[PDB]
Amino acid sequence: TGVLTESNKKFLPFQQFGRDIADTTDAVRDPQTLEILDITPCSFGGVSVITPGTNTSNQVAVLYQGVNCTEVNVFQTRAGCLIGAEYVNNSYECDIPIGAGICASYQSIIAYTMSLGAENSVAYSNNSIAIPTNFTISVTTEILPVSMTKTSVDCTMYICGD
Amino acid sequence: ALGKLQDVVNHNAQALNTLVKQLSSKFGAISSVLNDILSRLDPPEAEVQIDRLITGRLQSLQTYVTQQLIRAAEIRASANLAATKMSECVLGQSKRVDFCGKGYHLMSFPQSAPHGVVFLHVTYVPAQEKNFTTAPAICHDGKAHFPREGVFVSNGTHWFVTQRNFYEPQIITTDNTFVSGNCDVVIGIVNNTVYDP
Amino acid sequence: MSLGAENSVAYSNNSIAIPTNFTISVTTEILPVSMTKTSVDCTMYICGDSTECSNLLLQYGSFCTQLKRALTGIAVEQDKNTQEVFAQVKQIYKTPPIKYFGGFNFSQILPDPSKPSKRSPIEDLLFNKVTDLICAQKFNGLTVLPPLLTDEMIAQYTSALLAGTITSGWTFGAGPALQIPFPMQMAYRFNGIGVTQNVLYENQKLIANQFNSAIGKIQDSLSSTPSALGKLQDVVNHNAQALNTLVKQLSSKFGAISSVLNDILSRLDPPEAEVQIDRLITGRLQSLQTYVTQQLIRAAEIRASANLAATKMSECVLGQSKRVDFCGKGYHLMSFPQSAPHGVVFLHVTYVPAQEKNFTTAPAICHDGKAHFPREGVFVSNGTHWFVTQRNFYEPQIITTDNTFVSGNCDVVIGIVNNTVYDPLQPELDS
Amino acid sequence: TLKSFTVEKGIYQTSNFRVQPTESIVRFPNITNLCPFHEVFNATTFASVYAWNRKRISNCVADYSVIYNFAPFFAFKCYGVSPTKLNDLCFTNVYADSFVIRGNEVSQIAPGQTGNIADYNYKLPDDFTGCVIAWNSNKLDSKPSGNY
Ligand SMILES: *[C@@H]1O[C@H](CO)[C@@H](O[C@@H]2O[C@H](CO)[C@@H](O)[C@H](O)[C@H]2NC(C)=O)[C@H](O)[C@H]1NC(C)=O
Ligand SMILES: *[C@@H]1O[C@H](CO)[C@@H](O[C@@H]2O[C@H](CO)[C@@H](O)[C@H](O)[C@H]2NC(C)=O)[C@H](O)[C@H]1NC(C)=O
Numbered sequence A: 001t002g003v004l005t006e007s008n009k010k011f012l013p014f015q016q017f018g019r020d021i022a023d024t025t026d027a028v029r030d031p032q033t034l035e036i037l038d039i040t041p042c043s044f045g046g047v048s049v050i051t052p053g054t055n056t057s058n059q060v061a062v063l064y065q066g067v068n069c070t071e072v073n074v075f076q077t078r079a080g081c082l083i084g085a086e087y088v089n090n091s092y093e094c095d096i097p098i099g100a101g102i103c104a105s106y107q108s109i110i111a112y113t114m115s116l117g118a119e120n121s122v123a124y125s126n127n128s129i130a131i132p133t134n135f136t137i138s139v140t141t142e143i144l145p146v147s148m149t150k151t152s153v154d155c156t157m158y159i160c161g162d
Numbered sequence B: 001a002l003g004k005l006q007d008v009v010n011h012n013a014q015a016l017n018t019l020v021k022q023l024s025s026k027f028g029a030i031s032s033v034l035n036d037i038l039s040r041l042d043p044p045e046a047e048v049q050i051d052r053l054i055t056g057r058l059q060s061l062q063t064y065v066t067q068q069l070i071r072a073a074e075i076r077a078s079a080n081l082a083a084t085k086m087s088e089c090v091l092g093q094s095k096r097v098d099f100c101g102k103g104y105h106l107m108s109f110p111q112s113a114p115h116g117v118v119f120l121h122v123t124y125v126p127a128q129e130k131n132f133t134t135a136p137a138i139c140h141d142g143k144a145h146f147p148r149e150g151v152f153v154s155n156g157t158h159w160f161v162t163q164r165n166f167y168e169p170q171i172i173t174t175d176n177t178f179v180s181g182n183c184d185v186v187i188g189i190v191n192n193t194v195y196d197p
Numbered sequence C: 001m002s003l004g005a006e007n008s009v010a011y012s013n014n015s016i017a018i019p020t021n022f023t024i025s026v027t028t029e030i031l032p033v034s035m036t037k038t039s040v041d042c043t044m045y046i047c048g049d050s051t052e053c054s055n056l057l058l059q060y061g062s063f064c065t066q067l068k069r070a071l072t073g074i075a076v077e078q079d080k081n082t083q084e085v086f087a088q089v090k091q092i093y094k095t096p097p098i099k100y101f102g103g104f105n106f107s108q109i110l111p112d113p114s115k116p117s118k119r120s121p122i123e124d125l126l127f128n129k130v131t132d133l134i135c136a137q138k139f140n141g142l143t144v145l146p147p148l149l150t151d152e153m154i155a156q157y158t159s160a161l162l163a164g165t166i167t168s169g170w171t172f173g174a175g176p177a178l179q180i181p182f183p184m185q186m187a188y189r190f191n192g193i194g195v196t197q198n199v200l201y202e203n204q205k206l207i208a209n210q211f212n213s214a215i216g217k218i219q220d221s222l223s224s225t226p227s228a229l230g231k232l233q234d235v236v237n238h239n240a241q242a243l244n245t246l247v248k249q250l251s252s253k254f255g256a257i258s259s260v261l262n263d264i265l266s267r268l269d270p271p272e273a274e275v276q277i278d279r280l281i282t283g284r285l286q287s288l289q290t291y292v293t294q295q296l297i298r299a300a301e302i303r304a305s306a307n308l309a310a311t312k313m314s315e316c317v318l319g320q321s322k323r324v325d326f327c328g329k330g331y332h333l334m335s336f337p338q339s340a341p342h343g344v345v346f347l348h349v350t351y352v353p354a355q356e357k358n359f360t361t362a363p364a365i366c367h368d369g370k371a372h373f374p375r376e377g378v379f380v381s382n383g384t385h386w387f388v389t390q391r392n393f394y395e396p397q398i399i400t401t402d403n404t405f406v407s408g409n410c411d412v413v414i415g416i417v418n419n420t421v422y423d424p425l426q427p428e429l430d431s
Numbered sequence D: 001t002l003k004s005f006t007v008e009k010g011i012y013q014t015s016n017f018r019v020q021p022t023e024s025i026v027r028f029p030n031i032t033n034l035c036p037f038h039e040v041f042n043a044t045t046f047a048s049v050y051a052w053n054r055k056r057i058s059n060c061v062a063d064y065s066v067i068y069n070f071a072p073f074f075a076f077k078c079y080g081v082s083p084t085k086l087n088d089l090c091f092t093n094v095y096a097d098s099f100v101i102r103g104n105e106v107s108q109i110a111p112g113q114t115g116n117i118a119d120y121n122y123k124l125p126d127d128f129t130g131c132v133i134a135w136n137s138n139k140l141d142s143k144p145s146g147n148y
């Protein structure tokens, strides 16, 4: 199953089958008409369903990974073609990661370029320093896993039972 | 907040669940139940069907054990990190930046959690900063004075010496400054008096 | 093979070696942070367009779901690794428009306005030096997924970290960014490694020249050595090699009549074609499980490297580290992060002592029946006179009561020598 | 388990204790009706392969031992079940398909088989379970001038 196209591969007279690097049949020759037809697999790609919780909404958007928009609210990304989300110039934090700097959120589903953070130009000079005049005692949490569930498997009883 | 520990529990349960689901796979045999194969097939063909079930179930169990070993390695690395935090944040004060919380670390408190530890990092965060005019050294009597433990600051008309992490202006004296050289070498030295006790 | 050059240290009971000069050494540390994000269509890889093969594949259970879940975990892990290493500041700091920092030149590490990519010359060099196979891999159901953070955003994060470490020192990593002149920041860093502020201020132009020369040498060294960026290229090579091997495994008969499923269907009846397709399915499934297992092991290794890179970014770039050899060879002063494909390059600026000189040393000075010990330095003698100097740089000063402390008499300390201890108050009360 | 005659101090997982069953209970339907296999296997006339006869077998207890006891059946080939285990099992969807074919076409009444009668007369599914019985019928289904 594939698309047959014209080829510019100079096949030798004995040769019939054409093989790519992976031994996939790149091209084929026909007995009835002695011409070389390049074989290319038909268009395909991965579908990713971008969705918020079902608690909030039932709207979904689809991302066709690595597929340009002309071979399938249409937005072209480096990750692929995004259908169902409207690109917004406004930058926000990443809610649902799409890829290549693009993230999605629900507000309808919007797609935007993720914001790295707020700009803060420090007023550097050659003779000025900033000295703290107060302090905040901050307590923060750090959660670290230590152990796992201890599992034992009876190999004979699992595979064979009784 | 506590998703990481929950993820560990979830992964373990999911792996066990998948392994039980693997018992309901025929693996290319007539049935997934050994009793059905024993009751419906004579031993010549029964050995082949049980062989198919044995190889598929053994492959599933090997896959599960391999996943468990990789996850055990990850949890061992996390536990070694947690022990390092327990030794260096709780049992001492750490000068390592961001190891024991955001900010200058003061102390830490351990709390037990299911399959894990939660560290309450008590840190000192500077706040309410103010601009001051600064100089590297003070020129007095043809000598350059440098701060012993602080920094020279100016509020506009007067010069003081203060500690770097809190604003506590003190008069520039010979007790909090040291003399090294004349005033001709330091770039940016300003002229100000240095008091003598 | 030789282990190293033979050196005999001139150890004696009362001789010390004190450095009289220094070298500002900038060294490179290359750490892998992320891998190539790979996704595998299990059904398309094992069976392609064959419905009968998929039907037979369904009998094996949730192997395909397990492999997809593992690859998805690795793919999100790589983005998490990049977030952990580079996204450590929530403020995007920017440098002042006048790039004067007291003689220090940061052109090679700050972003270049001329370039469309907004990268530094060093980062541009790093990106250049790290680089129908792809079509076959795609056509066999294996897809490479784009990184969540683009190269320009990672470069922007490195730029923000550089601007914070240059304009604010280590203050921005521990709270609000507090501005400080760069010579004063370097003096603070000199104080961190036990050298007085005067040594930095008096030799400011020499230190700036040494730093600029070291940065230029770093750029030349990276541009002139092919094996400098071997770690990142090695990771790219392993990922590409694994995908190529996985694609190559489709041409294996695995004990069946043919490696092509269409030929098996076109040539045999379902009772025996099912057997041949089973042989192909078990071989291809074993290959895919092997690939996923090595991917998980490599993911663990890259995660460890990323955790190390995050620790270096926190302790070397956002602060000054007293850990030996963690942030370069020598006494660590500061560090600069540079983005690289699948990794981070740390430029460690360290202080290396040089031009050491021998001196006669004593543990204490006996004066007026009392033992005097140095407050912060070491007693040295040039042959006839005794002085007290700082340990990491030779700066002889007169032994006074201001820089020594008295503990006990002269009868207990082994090796005490007799010398006068000056009193500052003595000329004052006399006059 | 440890493959040694000296065991060091510790706790060792050796095997799994499981209580064994005390007796075997067989529960089968109480209803007992002799199954009409005589009608299917001893019939004087059979149907053609294009119009093959299908007989439903239900609500009977089947003794397959008598099938073995009297049998001129040259071919007795079973696909999804053992021939000797038929007396110990319970079934439904039981159908007897009777027809007459040539001597060399007996290989074609099987799942996945290639043939003329397989394609246009009688087709078996790929997942077929059951037994095919073939026996010579020269004495009854032949005539000297040609039985057409
Ligand atoms: C120290 O003074 C500088 C000016 O020299 C202040 O920087 C300005 O801050 C305002 C408000 O944030 C900005 O609108 C200006 O653009 C800044 N100027 C420059 C040149 O960047 C700085 O805020 C002062 N610091 C404190 C703590 O008050
Ligand atoms: C330093 O900050 C603390 C809080 O971080 C200030 O304490 C507050 O003072 C105001 C007025 O005196 C009170 O209304 C608040 O309730 C206080 N907060 C707390 C937590 O005690 C303190 O005044 C600040 N000091 C300086 C010199 O700025």
Ligand SMILES: *[C@@H]1O[C@H](CO)[C@@H](O[C@@H]2O[C@H](CO)[C@@H](O)[C@H](O)[C@H]2NC(C)=O)[C@H](O)[C@H]1NC(C)=O
Residues within 6 Å of the ligand: B155, B156, B157, B158
């Ligand atoms: C800088 O601080 C100093 C001391 O805190 C200020 O000097 C004092 O100012 C007060 C009020 O103006 C006077 O009553 C004192 O007599 C001053 N002390 C001396 C020793 O003269 C100084 O005014 C501050 N400068 C600015 C610009 O605020």
Ligand SMILES: *[C@@H]1O[C@H](CO)[C@@H](O[C@@H]2O[C@H](CO)[C@@H](O)[C@H](O)[C@H]2NC(C)=O)[C@H](O)[C@H]1NC(C)=O
Residues within 6 Å of the ligand: B139, B190, B191
């Ligand atoms: C700081 O004080 C010194 C000495 O009091 C000043 O140096 C003198 O500057 C004048 C004017 O340029 C010269 O004529 C003298 O020869 C200098 N003397 C010495 C010993 O260098 C200096 O100008 C003062 N600086 C400031 C900023 O006020």
Ligand SMILES: *[C@@H]1O[C@H](CO)[C@@H](O[C@@H]2O[C@H](CO)[C@@H](O)[C@H](O)[C@H]2NC(C)=O)[C@H](O)[C@H]1NC(C)=O
Residues within 6 Å of the ligand: C008, C009, C010, C011, C017, C356, C357, C358
């Ligand atoms: C300090 O003095 C010692 C001994 O006086 C010097 O050590 C000698 O170095 C030379 C040159 O490498 C060797 O040939 C000798 O064998 C060494 N002597 C011993 C006893 O080891 C040392 O070089 C001096 N240090 C400096 C900085 O000059």
Ligand SMILES: *[C@@H]1O[C@H](CO)[C@@H](O[C@@H]2O[C@H](CO)[C@@H](O)[C@H](O)[C@H]2NC(C)=O)[C@H](O)[C@H]1NC(C)=O
Residues within 6 Å of the ligand: C020, C021, C022, C023, C206, C209, C210, C355
């Ligand atoms: C400390 O070392 C520096 C170099 O690291 C010396 O600076 C050199 O000085 C010589 C002659 O004075 C010049 O020819 C070189 O060009 C200088 N090099 C650099 C990089 O500036 C400096 O003189 C040394 N100081 C001492 C006291 O030994």
Ligand SMILES: *[C@@H]1O[C@H](CO)[C@@H](O[C@@H]2O[C@H](CO)[C@@H](O)[C@H](O)[C@H]2NC(C)=O)[C@H](O)[C@H]1NC(C)=O
Residues within 6 Å of the ligand: C099, C105, C106, C107, C108
């Ligand atoms: C900082 O260093 C850069 C390069 O390291 C200097 O740029 C060089 O400037 C000279 C003279 O203008 C040119 O001949 C070189 O071609 C430049 N090099 C590059 C790479 O552009 C720069 O002058 C230095 N000083 C400042 C203040 O930026």
Ligand SMILES: *[C@@H]1O[C@H](CO)[C@@H](O[C@@H]2O[C@H](CO)[C@@H](O)[C@H](O)[C@H]2NC(C)=O)[C@H](O)[C@H]1NC(C)=O
Residues within 6 Å of the ligand: C382, C383, C384, C385
């Ligand atoms: C040890 O150092 C002291 C001080 O630097 C030297 O004493 C001075 O030496 C110079 C030149 O010999 C004389 O011009 C000075 O008058 C000396 N000062 C005093 C206070 O005596 C001493 O010579 C050095 N010793 C050696 C062996 O180099």
Ligand SMILES: *[C@@H]1O[C@H](CO)[C@@H](O[C@@H]2O[C@H](CO)[C@@H](O)[C@H](O)[C@H]2NC(C)=O)[C@H](O)[C@H]1NC(C)=O
Residues within 6 Å of the ligand: C366, C417, C418
């Ligand atoms: C250091 O000084 C002390 C005291 O000035 C010396 O001790 C004297 O040594 C002489 C000869 O050994 C005796 O006659 C005195 O009685 C000692 N006096 C005391 C108070 O002990 C000591 O010898 C000196 N050390 C050196 C190396 O010269």
Ligand SMILES: *[C@@H]1O[C@H](CO)[C@@H](O)[C@H](O)[C@H]1NC(C)=O
Residues within 6 Å of the ligand: A031, A032, A033
């Ligand atoms: C038929 O095939 C032969 C080669 O097999 C070719 O030479 C010939 O031209 C074909 N005839 C036509 C009418 O295309």
Ligand SMILES: *[C@@H]1O[C@H](CO)[C@@H](O)[C@H](O)[C@H]1NC(C)=O
Residues within 6 Å of the ligand: A124, A125, A126, C098, C100
């Ligand atoms: C001090 O800073 C100003 C602007 O911030 C700059 O123009 C000036 O050149 C700097 N001083 C020196 C000596 O470069």
Ligand SMILES: *[C@@H]1O[C@H](CO)[C@@H](O)[C@H](O)[C@H]1NC(C)=O
Residues within 6 Å of the ligand: C011, C012, C013
């Ligand atoms: C000092 O060192 C030398 C050799 O370096 C040794 O012979 C001598 O015994 C030492 N002094 C003392 C008091 O032990």
Ligand SMILES: *[C@@H]1O[C@H](CO)[C@@H](O)[C@H](O)[C@H]1NC(C)=O
Residues within 6 Å of the ligand: D038, D042, D044
């Ligand atoms: C089979 O049919 C024949 C007549 O065709 C009859 O004589 C014989 O008794 C039958 N056998 C059984 C078991 O019914």
